[PDB]
Amino acid sequence: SQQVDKIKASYPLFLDQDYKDMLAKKRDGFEEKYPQDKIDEVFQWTTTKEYQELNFQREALTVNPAKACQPLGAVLCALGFEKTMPYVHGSQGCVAYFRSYFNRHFREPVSCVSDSMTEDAAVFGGQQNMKDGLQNCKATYKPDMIAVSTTCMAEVIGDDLNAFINNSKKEGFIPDEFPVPFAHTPSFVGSHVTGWDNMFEGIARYFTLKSMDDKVVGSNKKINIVPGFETYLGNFRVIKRMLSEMGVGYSLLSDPEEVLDTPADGQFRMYAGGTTQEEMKDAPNALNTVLLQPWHLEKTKKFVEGTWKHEVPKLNIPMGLDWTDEFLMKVSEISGQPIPASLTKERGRLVDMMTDSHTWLHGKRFALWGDPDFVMGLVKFLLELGCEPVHILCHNGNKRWKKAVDAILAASPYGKNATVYIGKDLWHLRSLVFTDKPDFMIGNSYGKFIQRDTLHKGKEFEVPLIRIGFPIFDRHHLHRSTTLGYEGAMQILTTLVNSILERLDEETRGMQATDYNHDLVR
Amino acid sequence: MRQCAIYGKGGIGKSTTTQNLVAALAEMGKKVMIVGCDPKADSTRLILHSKAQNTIMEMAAEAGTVEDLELEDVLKAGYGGVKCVESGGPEPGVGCAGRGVITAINFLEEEGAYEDDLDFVFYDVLGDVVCGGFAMPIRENKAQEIYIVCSGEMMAMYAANNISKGIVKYANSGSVRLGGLICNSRNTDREDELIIALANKLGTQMIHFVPRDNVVQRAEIRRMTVIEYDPKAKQADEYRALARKVVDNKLLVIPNPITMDELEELLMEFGIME
Amino acid sequence: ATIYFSSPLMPHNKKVQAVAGKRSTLLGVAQENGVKIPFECQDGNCGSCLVKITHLDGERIKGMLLTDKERNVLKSVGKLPKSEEERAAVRDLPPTYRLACQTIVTDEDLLVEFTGEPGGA
Amino acid sequence: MSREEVESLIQEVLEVYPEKARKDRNKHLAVNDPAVTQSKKCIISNKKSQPGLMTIRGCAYAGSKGVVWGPIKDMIHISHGPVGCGQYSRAGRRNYYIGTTGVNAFVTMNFTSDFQEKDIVFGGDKKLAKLIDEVETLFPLNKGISVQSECPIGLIGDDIESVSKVKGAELSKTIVPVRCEGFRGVSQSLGHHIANDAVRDWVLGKRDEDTTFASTPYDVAIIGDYNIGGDAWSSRILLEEMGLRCVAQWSGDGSISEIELTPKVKLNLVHCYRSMNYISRHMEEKYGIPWMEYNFFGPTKTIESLRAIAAKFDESIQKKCEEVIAKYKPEWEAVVAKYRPRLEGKRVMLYIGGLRPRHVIGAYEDLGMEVVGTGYEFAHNDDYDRTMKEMGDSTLLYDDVTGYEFEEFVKRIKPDLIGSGIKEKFIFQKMGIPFREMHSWDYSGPYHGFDGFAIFARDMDMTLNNPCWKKLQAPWE
Ligand SMILES: Nc1ncnc2c1ncn2[C@@H]1O[C@H](COP(=O)(O)OP(=O)(O)O)[C@@H](O)[C@H]1O
Ligand code: ICS
Ligand code: CLF
Ligand code: SF4
Ligand code: FES
Ligand SMILES: [Fe+3]
Ligand SMILES: [Mg+2]
């Protein structure tokens, strides 16, 4: 039954009495559902601490992973180039899933192609698939360069990329002068950030390996910026603005903001902006090269140090106050350009914000997860805010990263009750937040279910989720936010303090029960 | 629309006599089809004037598969009346050597190259061993009439006997019948009445006895048929006569296979072998 | 998966258990088990490994993809009737004839016959 | 209209492709002729996608785990292999259900084997066994386990059948090993077939002895309804109001007990013929269970299917069906009266996976829209024979359409509404053309029955007649 005036969505149409009766009949008749008290008992058992001990004894089962395979990062890195297409030498399912994932996250068109092999190539290799895919892509979508990544199956079959590409260019399939950089991206090693790093290193090696005779460091008076795996266009914007406000010649490399954000004006642009090929060819002439995310840019670090002869600074990712200041120090000392007064005013605005919101930010307990450098930046910023990070998880973090985060936690008196986990998944976070309740979690959309679980135990045990990281699916246009720099710290502080105040307002809204604290001014 | 096939030992002038028969058939207002199943693609050399016709399977493999093959790319009409197609063969030791005939003929019916303008279709099949693709035109009843090329050499007779056994085995499947025997002549004594006697004991008729002549080698250097080279040559008139008896041949019989010993007895009684 | 290899060349049909879904095809399981099926190419075009496949357990029939190369080679030998082609194209059902180097092992019991001759008599 | 314009359009679109791609793609575009019964002479389907053409098809793992096995709630599904495959398929499909997550239901959770380099080098059989044991210890309530193989499992040659049998014997639990490697098959159709075969060869055979269930001359099993946004619940309440008893639901809100009890059902109602025709055929052959296709999209199709459904039982079911029709008539009459004038005359093109292009033409036509173009990613020839009649003359039909192609046809045709997936929603939304997600109902629904028909009409009026579509061009341009 549906009233024409009040058309009703599935919620709450399925809350009608007749639908409830039919669902009850089905469950009692044919689902053979276990008794409800048994379900509640098992839920309470999963809440308990011995279940946490059993959960931490896991070595073969991963429940709710917080990472993606390398070709996703490879595609994200490849999309950062001008008139460029990502070509994943593998099965079409991989490309379909990457495109669906990025369409869900960024809510913008994403272009990616594959050779879509089958049993034929599984038994006899996919050299022919390479040839047809390359020539078809060139004839159809007219790119200026095709960046080739690989899936798991192409790596397992031992498919090499250089030989097949050379044979395709030799047999007249594609022009011999067409830039076609490649990289090996196995899905069983590392995570998406490692794939981004591999793709970037492959492109840099294709473009700047056979022409190192005439390259002189510092010739063009320019700095190279490598952003790494980034899903925040605002980070690119703040980097560009901060460097432009400082009067420094900068070369952002693999930057996809222009293609990941295009104006709707009646026509669809498959290609939009990007780093030109000359910029990569002119990269070794730069004075230096800084990496925005060092802990997932190690292979490209080795390449840039051993080939471009650039003294890469030991810089941490520009989140918070201290590390942004260090980044500005390094940029100033490399370029020789003094810090403008506008940056000082913005930093002072940050200090004013932290002073204003310290009365609420202090003493709060946070469980956070995400990519390693994002996680470490958030931990540092929380430590500068008087917060108390209780549960730190990085699914794709190594032992050295754990040692570094341990060192940074030992440097502040607010890291006393902090524990760092690597190789853990979101089920371990659910167990941790159930046994040792934090005040909030900081993570992507996948944690929203954990909150739900807490809400079953009770309102006093429910812990809310603030969405920072990747991927964010249940909120719209939050990918536009800024995280790095003073502006990013500004936005993070605003979001955190507003979530805290919203939680307090929701708790103190009971009428004649808890509304005595429902203050107008906070 | 009659379909015929040259069966016989290699090197007995199958391709050359066949092609001269085609040249003779072209001029009296007849449109004819030529395809050669010989692994060497020399069955269409003289008509097409090409150095070597690109066979069906070579450019099918280069183009990926036979689906991506165009009829016009293999259906070349060197002369106006006649078109020329080559079946081809695999590399030695790579599968059965007759599947090229399978693919060629299947593609030919698939694209319908047998439509509304055919008077004769003529195939040149290697008759040394009848098996797989070589035995195929006997089997699916594609070639109604079969003609055997032979000489005075004993292996030619043995090959003709194997052809007779093959057609006898598949007589009930269709209208595959032996239309006669044609025998080229080497410079050896007591030849024509020999093949006449083989036909007599075979239950079949002797079509024509084509001799060895000098004009053939000159045509080979020329890469045009004798009738196209020298229409006044006596060999050209011989080929024309052969063609007109092929067109005017009426009897098509079920052959009788002949044992080894009786063949040997004929061979000793003629003295071709001791 | 159980495989039963039968041939006039073999005095006795050989039974042996195989792992379903291995990247190595029935060609591999033929080589490791001392059964000789003529093999004459590494690109799957010769067709000399043509074999008769029978699924004894009719209920346990597994869908599979008949690739274009196997389809065209089966046309080249001629062991592909029109009805079998249409059935494989629509219902994704295996044909009676297969190529040993292009057939994947499925989790069931199978009987494979050959004459020891290359595909095409 | 303008059929000549259509084939000239497809000629002018196909020129950019090379000779191989052009020749192959020319077989996959056609102009509909309703008089054609065998589509094999007009359209070619179920073929491999041309490499490097931005295809939309998925993998067999998507067709099996993300489509068939996933909706089942009381079983735990293990993505055997690397991490990306399950992660990109985690809760991306709105197969609704009732239950508690992590305790008795595990639909929206990701179980993966977490393969690494040593797992590829040495094997994953022992790791799979340890994982099964750990699943049993961490999750006692679950009724069963399925193991969905991914590309590396098939490529490295692990024996998941043997470990499944051994662990099932040891723990007295149903373990279903399914081989849905992404390279297997050209699209999700082989994933559907593999999932169906695994269901047939494990669950159906798991119990044949039981007869303890009390049957009724009115047992009907829903087949191929995945409760996308609640579709299966609306279909089920419509069925139960008619006087039947729904025993099994495959697989949205589907339970393993219903799957096992399904062979004790008098009549099978197949919703998605493509995804679940194999099991229907196997059931009809073995248990002698009659099955038939029904459509619940739009009032006309719903009424026709309901009448045909009641035609297979006694007169009481027919009387109840007439009562239900009379009861629900005014609701959809009012919906039509409200929304048809705003919706009359608009032209729409569609592109959905399988049987959805043909199922929803009735709903579009009831509201005054007409379909000018349609097609499928992975439908076979039988679906095309079924759908040629339902489309008007001189309309567009396409299979495995590419991004460039689809963009050119939409540019030339210029429709008013387009229904397709997420991967095209934003490439078409920037061209100023309204677009509806036809897979997930755009986080809305359901669309089945009259209750879902109301949602369908509301959403379509909402999307098509929106002010935002009038402001794509700047006033100073
Ligand atoms: N009437 C003839 N006079 C002279 N030589 C001939 C005659 N017919 C055939 N030959 C010779 O027989 C040889 C066989 O040629 P061809 O037919 O191409 O090979 P095959 O007999 O194996 O098909 C040729 O080199 C040709 O010179
Ligand atoms: S199962 Fe199939 S792609 Fe038949 S894989 Fe896909 S819930 Fe589509 S056109 Mo998503 S063959 Fe169902 C489908 Fe249709 S997931 Fe749903 S909408 S009716
Ligand atoms: S076609 Fe299908 S979905 Fe694709 S991989 Fe293959 S089974 Fe899977 Fe998952 S893990 Fe990542 S995304 Fe692939 S590259 Fe290796
Ligand atoms: S049938 Fe004849 S052509 Fe074929 S492989 Fe055997 S001997 Fe060779
Ligand atoms: S070995 Fe040649 S086709 Fe199998
Ligand atoms: Fe957008
Ligand atoms: Mg010759």
What would your notes on this structure say?
- The structure is cut from a larger assembly and holds chains A (522 residues), B (274 residues), C (121 residues) and D (477 residues).
- Chain A has 522 residues and is of the alpha/beta class.
- Chain A has 21 helices and twelve strands.
- In chain A, strand 5 (223-226), helix 12 (233-245) and strand 6 (250-252) form a beta-alpha-beta unit.
- Chain B has helices spanning 14-27, 45-48, 56-62, 71-74, 99-111, 136-139, 154-169, 192-202, 215-222, 226-229, 234-247, 260-270; strands spanning 2-8, 32-36, 83-86, 120-126, 145-150, 177-184, 206-210.
- The N and C termini of chain B lie far apart (45 Å).
- With 121 residues, chain C is an alpha+beta fold.
- Chain C has one domain (1-118).
- The longest helix of chain C has 10 residues, at 68-77.
- The termini of chain C are far apart.
- In chain C, 43% of the residues are buried.
- Chains in contact: A-C, A-D, B-C, C-D.
- The interface between A and D is large, with 103 and 120 residues.
- Strand 1 (62-63) of chain A pairs antiparallel with strand 3 of chain D, so a sheet runs across the interface.
- The complex binds adenosine-5'-diphosphate, iron-sulfur-molybdenum cluster with interstitial carbon (ICS), FE(8)-S(7) cluster, iron/sulfur cluster, FE2/S2 (inorganic) cluster (FES), fe (iii) ion (FE) and 1 more.
- Adenosine-5'-diphosphate binds next to helix 1 of chain B.
Span from first to last CA of chain A?
47 Å
Instruction: Please write the string of helix (H) and strand (E) elements of chain B.
Output: EHEHHHEHEHEHEHEHHHH
What is the class of the largest domain in chain A in the CATH system? Alpha Beta
Shape of chain B: globular
Helix percent of chain A reads: 40-55%
Query: Structurally, how many domains make up the residues of chain A?
Result: 4
Shape of chain A: globular
Terminal residue distance of chain B: 45 Å
Side by side, the strands of the main sheet of chain B go 3-2-4-1-5-6-7
- Named CATH architecture of the largest domain in chain A: 3-Layer(aba) Sandwich
- The CATH homologous superfamily of the largest domain in chain A is termed Nitrogenase molybdenum iron protein domain
Q: Specify Rg of chain A, calculated over alpha carbons.
A: 26 Å
The number of helices of chain B is 12
Percent of sequence in beta strands of chain A: 5-15%
Count of discrete alpha- or pi-helical segments spanning 4 or more residues of chain A: 21
PDB class: metal binding protein
Keywords: Nitrogenase, FeMoCo, nitrogen, P-cluster, metal binding protein
Entry title: Azotobacter vinelandii 1:1:1 MoFeP:FeP:FeSII-Complex (C1 symmetry)
Chain A: Nitrogenase molybdenum-iron protein beta chain
